[PDB]
Design an enzyme around this catalytic site. Structure first.
Site, PDB file in Angstrom:
ATOM      1  N   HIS A  29      -8.430   3.059   4.229  1.00  0.00           N
ATOM      2  CA  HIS A  29      -8.346   2.590   2.938  1.00  0.00           C
ATOM      3  C   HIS A  29      -9.708   2.359   1.934  1.00  0.00           C
ATOM      4  O   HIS A  29     -10.651   1.717   2.691  1.00  0.00           O
ATOM      5  CB  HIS A  29      -7.599   1.371   2.926  1.00  0.00           C
ATOM      6  CG  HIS A  29      -5.903   1.752   3.223  1.00  0.00           C
ATOM      7  ND1 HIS A  29      -5.711   2.678   3.820  1.00  0.00           N
ATOM      8  CD2 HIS A  29      -4.963   0.988   3.256  1.00  0.00           C
ATOM      9  CE1 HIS A  29      -4.143   2.715   3.828  1.00  0.00           C
ATOM     10  NE2 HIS A  29      -3.947   1.668   3.807  1.00  0.00           N
TER      11      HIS A  29
ATOM     12  N   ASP B 135     -10.174   0.150  -0.114  1.00  0.00           N
ATOM     13  CA  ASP B 135     -10.309  -1.390  -0.229  1.00  0.00           C
ATOM     14  C   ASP B 135     -10.957  -2.033   1.121  1.00  0.00           C
ATOM     15  O   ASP B 135     -11.310  -2.989   1.172  1.00  0.00           O
ATOM     16  CB  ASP B 135      -8.990  -2.001  -0.389  1.00  0.00           C
ATOM     17  CG  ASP B 135      -7.899  -1.491   0.212  1.00  0.00           C
ATOM     18  OD1 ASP B 135      -7.544  -0.338  -0.014  1.00  0.00           O
ATOM     19  OD2 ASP B 135      -7.444  -2.274   0.940  1.00  0.00           O
TER      20      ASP B 135
ATOM     21  N   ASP C  70       0.718  -1.084   0.050  1.00  0.00           N
ATOM     22  CA  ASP C  70       0.263   0.060  -0.145  1.00  0.00           C
ATOM     23  C   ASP C  70       0.910   1.071   0.307  1.00  0.00           C
ATOM     24  O   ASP C  70       0.330   2.403   0.019  1.00  0.00           O
ATOM     25  CB  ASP C  70      -0.850   0.120   1.094  1.00  0.00           C
ATOM     26  CG  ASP C  70      -0.103   0.194   2.687  1.00  0.00           C
ATOM     27  OD1 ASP C  70       0.918   0.010   2.664  1.00  0.00           O
ATOM     28  OD2 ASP C  70      -0.965  -0.185   3.731  1.00  0.00           O
TER      29      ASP C  70
ATOM     30  N   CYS D 147       2.585  -6.437   6.548  1.00  0.00           N
ATOM     31  CA  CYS D 147       3.396  -5.886   5.157  1.00  0.00           C
ATOM     32  C   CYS D 147       2.855  -5.313   4.232  1.00  0.00           C
ATOM     33  O   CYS D 147       2.797  -4.261   3.935  1.00  0.00           O
ATOM     34  CB  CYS D 147       4.504  -7.041   5.093  1.00  0.00           C
TER      35      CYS D 147
END
Lengths: 594, 594
Positions: free
Chosen positions: A408, A410, A309, A576
């Site tokens: 975010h 998403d 990201d 991560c």
């Protein structure tokens, strides 16, 4: 277209240069003999001679008969074939009287035909015009691929065709020039260690050696993507200048142009076919990397490396090649490009091809998670959106993400392949779909089913029952709030993406509060990984009814009918980032007409 | 469209805010009662209630009968009239079974209707849409006049209409916001010494006090003309935000926009009617200032003051007023504006309205005297042409002026009113018209006529005869050269201005050399002053034949047929500059469609 006026004298011959195919129009400098009534025109074989009324558009061959003198008439001379030697062709005009058998006077014009052409390669969509850049299915332009914000096989070649007498260019100069503005954002190399940097940042003009015979090759490289002050257009010109009048000044004969457009940056939608997936290394989360490997092998190839990201992956494309590009804020590198804008949402945000409000978005639209008005902080609009609007190709829409702790797009939004309808479905997180589901299970007698029973099958980690959730008034009211937050975005998307309810699937998702803002009560289902027809879904750890996660069974009942395969991956199990590369659109960006 | 989803609960009532005229669509949060088969909807009188299939577009009133329950159905609620008090209206949904006489359950939604509108004044060309800026005869937008690169009666007023319960805004906030980009180039004052600077350079957002009842007035001022990085568009938004969920986060209800365009800078062509003439003071040249005064009184009013080619005069216009503006590189000031671009041709250069290559230029085209390629010096393009292309309204064409010692476009170019054809004539300096004239006079026996006989009637100043000029081979050849230079520009203009030969008049003009570049051999005729039908022409001091300057008689024979009056002014007789102000076009710039 082009025309040119060359003026001849009765007193002495005139010498001139014809550019191949351009209409030279021939007039007399000063007056025509006394008692002139008629005239004839004649030329050597390669010289096409015409007359035209200066009002009317047609042309007529003139060398075959004797015309009544009319000042209104135009002599037009064209030469389509270059000259072998200087002045190896000529035009003669003779003036005549009925009384005198012989020509009153002659006017002679020796000519040298040179062919000058500056050229690139555009496209054959509507082949055949002007030197500008036409968008659309019936348009044309040159394309420049930007590599960075041998040296370049992804370079754009430029050719100068110069046919004609060598000696002509002892006396005449060929200038290659561009604008200062265009020079800052592009650079040209002349072939021509061997490739010589002729047009560049400080360099605006360049005399052409003609070191290589008939054609002179150049290689153009675009240095900047279209920004707020850059449209992506780069023009280059060649000019033939006359510098034989050592006492007079230098004067232009002919100019040619070629127009390049910088190729925009295009985001790849999670409905495009996948190529490679970027997974960041996790010493801890072995099993999850195994699961993503299995998914990739279910669909394609997958590489792993020591965030996702932190950057975005898109592409640029020209007719010859498409180049993956990475937008940032060190790299893979081979077969890759880089774009960086310096003044941090950075997350993944783009829609599939769509039609809305009459306008058509063949390459989709970019979804920018906005920051609510009047807020101290800025979240995504750090005026790189400058850069994204400047791309012009995927008009962005602002969404409402301030209600999430993380924020975010998403987190509540996903686009998935569909075999019908518009070819895709929009998946939205929906507290309320979950509410409905839990109520239906409660009325069937399964109110005691325990969420987090798989997670807490062996490590006791605070299980909840359906009944306990449904009667937690505070949780329900908060989730009604975030459902309304999501409703707002749903209506925005339905407008700007011309979507119908039948195109939307609500995915049961609950939320809780971290510092008065939304986070996932149980693993965020909609935060998928979409690899063609295969889905990497965070396993929800929902209520076990009859030895099945009723949440998983719901998601299946929703998605499997569309041919999808749901693989529930253990994202949250151990106490991560993720990203993927996709093959480009079948659609070509230069065929869009914004 | 705009729609909005408000979700209701069976457990308890819901409270919501309707914006006047916006469609609220009403769904249920969670499941519908057991054994539900039918439903009814009902509202207080001011609440319009409809049903629609979520596939189909139509709506049907719903409060009159009992519907078979279909999840596919949509309830839509609109309120066109603001509320007097909070929650003074409501919507009730009841669910029904055939078996049970009474409603299974109720869902109640209390509503508060507020009317929020952000507005300016655009135009009634094609009145009736979206908040964007439409060019053309059937378009709309707000206009911003820029004054500088009481305080403003030439200000653009902005109004916020807020109708509804006062108490509503204890709990809800009205934000006026713009972009950072838009903020740098515009500023807003709230009425709220009395006018308060709310939106400005650092200021991006502003809570609205609602200090003044139903409507809140604002005054917008544009600070920048359209530049290379500025399109001239400025957007402002108002947003209603909900901040009642003290524990949750603030959430948007409604947003409105108004789009302004900065008015471009438009040059005035020497065919527009004259208003006032700027003449710079000359202690020496009394008689010339007298002559220009007589000309002005022949046409209009004329002011004089202690250069003219140092600056340019144009205008900006909005529906309410047009404002003269001066482009530079201290001022008149009252009723005037100023534009300055800092990084020197500066001279007067614009064409009349024209049609070319299918495209139409209602306001004419700007003629930029270019500098030949590959030249060390830059003459006009000092990338203020940035600013001129950015105006978008008068696409410029580059001309060839490097061959002149001075290099002004007006040295060989003039546009004059015509009573027919295209309504104007293009006058070009023509050595060759003079050549022809001198030859015709020579063949009639007047070869001995002396140029500069008026000038040297009393002060002997090196007179020349027609015969001496015609046989000075060097002068003739040089003038053939500058004639060809002018030919090039003639063809450029004929293309880009879709002109025909019959629209062009060649004016007999000779030239000589100053440092290998062109200057006027005798006073430059074409360097006119064009005040309607009256012309201030440099008196040529040409050959006197029968007590008349045959040059003057030629110019008359050319121009008087067009109704023009030629007044030959003694510019060169005694051993600062000239400029004029013109009334705007009848055509309005916002009706053009580039």
């Amino acid at each position: 277209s082009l025309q040119r006026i060359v003026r001849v004298s009765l007193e002495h011959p005139t010498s001139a240069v014809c550019v191949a195919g351009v209409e030279t129009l021939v007039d007399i400098y000063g007056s025509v003999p006394e008692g002139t009534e008629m005239f004839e025109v004649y030329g050597t074989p390669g010289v096409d001679i015409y007359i035209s009324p200066n009002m009317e558009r047609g042309r007529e061959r003139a060398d075959t008969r004797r015309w009544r003198f009319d000042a209104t008439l135009e002599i037009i001379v064209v030469m389509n074939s270059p000259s072998n030697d200087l002045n190896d062709s000529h035009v003669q005009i003779s003036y005549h009287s009925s009384h005198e058998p012989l020509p009153l006077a002659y006017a002679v014009l020796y000519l040298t035909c040179v062919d000058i052409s500056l050229d690139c390669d555009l496209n054959c969509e509507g082949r055949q015009d002007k030197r500008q850049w036409v968008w659309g299915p019936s348009g044309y332009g040159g394309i420049l691929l930007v590599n960075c914000d041998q040296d370049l096989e992804d370079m754009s070649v430029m050719v100068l065709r110069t046919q004609g007498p060598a000696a002509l260019f002892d006396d005449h100069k060929l200038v290659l020039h561009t604008s200062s503005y265009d020079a800052k954002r592009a650079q040209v190399f002349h072939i021509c260690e061997a490739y010589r940097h002729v047009l560049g940042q400080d360099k605006v003009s360049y005399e052409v050696p003609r070191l290589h015979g008939d054609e002179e090759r150049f290689f153009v490289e675009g240095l900047s993507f279209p920004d707020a002050g850059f449209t992506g257009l780069i023009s280059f010109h060649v000019t033939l200048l006359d510098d034989s009048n050592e006492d007079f000044s230098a004067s232009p004969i002919f100019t040619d142009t070629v127009v390049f457009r910088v190729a925009p940056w295009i985001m790849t939608p999670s409905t495009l076919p996948p190529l490679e997936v970027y997974v960041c290394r996790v010493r801890n989360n072995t099993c999850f990397v195994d699961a993503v490997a299995e998914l990739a092998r279910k669909a394609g190839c997958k590489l792993t490396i020591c965030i996702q990201d932190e950057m975005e992956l898109g592409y640029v494309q020209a007719p010859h090649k498409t180049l993956p590009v990475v937008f940032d804020s060190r790299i893979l590198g081979p077969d890759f490009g880089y774009v960086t804008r310096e003044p941090s949402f950075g997350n993944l945000e783009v829609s599939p091809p769509v039609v809305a409000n009459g306008k058509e978005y063949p390459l989709g639209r970019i979804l920018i998670g906005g920051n609510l008005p009047g807020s101290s902080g800025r979240r995504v609009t750090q005026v790189v959106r400058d850069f994204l609007h400047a791309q012009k190709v995927q008009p962005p829409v602002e969404l409402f993400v301030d209600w999430l702790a993380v924020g975010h797009v998403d987190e509540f939004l996903s686009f998935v392949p569909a075999p019908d309808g518009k070819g895709f479905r929009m998946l939205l997180a929906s507290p309320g779909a979950c509410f409905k589901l839990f109520q239906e299970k409660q009325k069937c007698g399964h109110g005691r089913a325990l969420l987090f029973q798989g997670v807490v099958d062996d490590e006791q980690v605070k299980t909840i029952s359906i009944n306990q959730v449904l009667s937690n008034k505070d949780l329900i009211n908060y989730n009604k709030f975030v459902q309304s937050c999501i409703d707002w975005n749903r209506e925005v998307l339905k407008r700007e993406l011309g979507l119908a309810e039948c195109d939307i699937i609500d995915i049961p998702q609950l939320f809780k509060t971290e510092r008065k803002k939304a986070t996932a009560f149980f693993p965020d289902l909609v935060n998928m990984l979409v690899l063609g027809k295969h889905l990497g879904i965070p396993k929800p750890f929902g209520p076990i009814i009859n030895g099945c996660c009723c949440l998983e069974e719901k998601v299946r009942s929703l998605l499997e009918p569309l041919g999808l395969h749901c693989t529930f991956i253990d994202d949250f199990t151990p106490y991560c980032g993720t990203n993927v590369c996709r093959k480009p659109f079948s659609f070509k960006w230069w065929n869009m007409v914004p």
